[PDB]
Amino acid sequence: MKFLLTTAQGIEDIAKREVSLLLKKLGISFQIEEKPLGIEGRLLLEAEKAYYVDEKGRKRELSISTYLNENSRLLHRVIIEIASEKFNGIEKDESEEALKRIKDFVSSLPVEQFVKVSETFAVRSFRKGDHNITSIDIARTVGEAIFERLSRFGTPLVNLDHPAVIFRAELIKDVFFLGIDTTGDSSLHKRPWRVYDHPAHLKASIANAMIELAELDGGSVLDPMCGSGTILIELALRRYSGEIIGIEKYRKHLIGAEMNALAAGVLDKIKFIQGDATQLSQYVDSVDFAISNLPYGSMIPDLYMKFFNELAKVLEKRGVFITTEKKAIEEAIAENGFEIIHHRVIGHGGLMVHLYVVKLEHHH
Numbered sequence: 001m002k003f004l005l006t007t008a009q010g011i012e013d014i015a016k017r018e019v020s021l022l023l024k025k026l027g028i029s030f031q032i033e034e035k036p037l038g039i040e041g042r043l044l045l046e047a048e049k050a051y052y053v054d055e056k057g058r059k060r061e062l063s064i065s066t067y068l069n070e071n072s073r074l075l076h077r078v079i080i081e082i083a084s085e086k087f088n089g090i091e092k093d094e095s096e097e098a099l100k101r102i103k104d105f106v107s108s109l110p111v112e113q114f115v116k117v118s119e120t121f122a123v124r125s126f127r128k129g130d131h132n133i134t135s136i137d138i139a140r141t142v143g144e145a146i147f148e149r150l151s152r153f154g155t156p157l158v159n160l161d162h163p164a165v166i167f168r169a170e171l172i173k174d175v176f177f178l179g180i181d182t183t184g185d186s187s188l189h190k191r192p193w194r195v196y197d198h199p200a201h202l203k204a205s206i207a208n209a210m211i212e213l214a215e216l217d218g219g220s221v222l223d224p225m226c227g228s229g230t231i232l233i234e235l236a237l238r239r240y241s242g243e244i245i246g247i248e249k250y251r252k253h254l255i256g257a258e259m260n261a262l263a264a265g266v267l268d269k270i271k272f273i274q275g276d277a278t279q280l281s282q283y284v285d286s287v288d289f290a291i292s293n294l295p296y297g298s299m300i301p302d303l304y305m306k307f308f309n310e311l312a313k314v315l316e317k318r319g320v321f322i323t324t325e326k327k328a329i330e331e332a333i334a335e336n337g338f339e340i341i342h343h344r345v346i347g348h349g350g351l352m353v354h355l356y357v358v359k360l361e362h363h364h
């Protein structure tokens with residue numbers, strides 16, 4: 001089996017590590033390629049089927065897709081792959097031509113091997129790049145192709161609302177992909193605990209990526225501009241052994257973090273404090289780690305300067321931060337005796353953000 005695993009742009013290596021350890025725990029053999037065909041936010045999983053002997057003394061199969069869906073914090077979707085292929089030139093093709101290429105390719109795929117005769121299906125599409133065709137066109141044409149093909153075998157059953165099987169068709173630049181979406185219509189980063197929806201909230205897979213990159217060890221963790229509390233809640237939910245502190249300036253957001261925390265089951269695990277991060281040291285004396293998604297906004301260059309000056313008074317190990325304001329954070333880091341020990345660019349729902357791992361320069 002081969003699977004297409006999606007996550008956020010620029011965290012594919014962190015996902016791959018996560019999925020590797022989970023799979024080593026089944027005892028199966030597998031390989032993971034990052035960014036198949038050059039496409040960001042994807043891994044290609046090639047695995048053995050996972051077989052055990054059941055209560056009747058027979059070989060039975062365990063679902064790799066369901067195991068990943070229930071146990072991953074970093075993935076968005078787990079898709080069973082039917083095919084994926086480079087349609088060279090397709091961006092430049094006229095619309096009639098592009099859809100011809102897609103239909104012909106789809107007609108030739110053994111899709112009847114991936115659905116029963118009684119199961120209803122629908123087609124969901126996603127498209128990224130510059131084409132003379134839309135996601136809607138793609139969904140129709142693929143949906144046509146699948147239907148014509150299944151009906152050589154029986155009576156296909158369509159259900160657009162509550163299908164039983166979802167074929168997902170994606171076209172990103174000139175790369176076309178078809179598979180079976182096991183995760184469903186709600187992507188995996190959607191958290192049921194999220195009752196309060198902060199307008200700049202962090203996606204939960206990217207929050208788990210920040211946590212990974214901190215390389216936590218049980219020391220105290222502080223989010224000193226914690227907003228609705230995503231990073232601390234995802235930490236508490238990993239059953240983190242260490243102390244968890246959040247600070248937030250505005251009482252409405254802070255109360256929102258408290259609600260999400262209660263809704264998650266983890267309120268007693270996080271200390272939540274109303275405060276200004278520009279005055280951090282009135283609130284705490286020493287913390288091992290700081291992890292934050294900083295405000296993006298001209299008063300920013302000053303807010304950052306002052307926060308990093310106070311952080312410098314309290315931080316024992318590593319800070320992990322994200323922001324859009326490259327020049328503002330890098331000046332504050334430099335001016336304040338910080339050292340950047342990792343940088344990477346991350347896609348955050350259509351916004352390229354920066355992530356910085358820092359430590360004090362004079363720590364050795």
Ligand SMILES: Nc1ncnc2c1ncn2[C@@H]1O[C@H](CSCC[C@H](N)C(=O)O)[C@@H](O)[C@H]1O
Pocket residue numbers: 198200201202203224225226227228229230231247248249250253275276277278293294295303
């Ligand atoms: N000086 C300051 N001190 C403390 N918090 C501040 C601040 N200036 C801005 N903030 C807060 O920092 C937050 C940044 S974004 C919210 C955090 C996170 N992305 C989430 O998933 O919920 C905003 O809520 C803002 O209120």
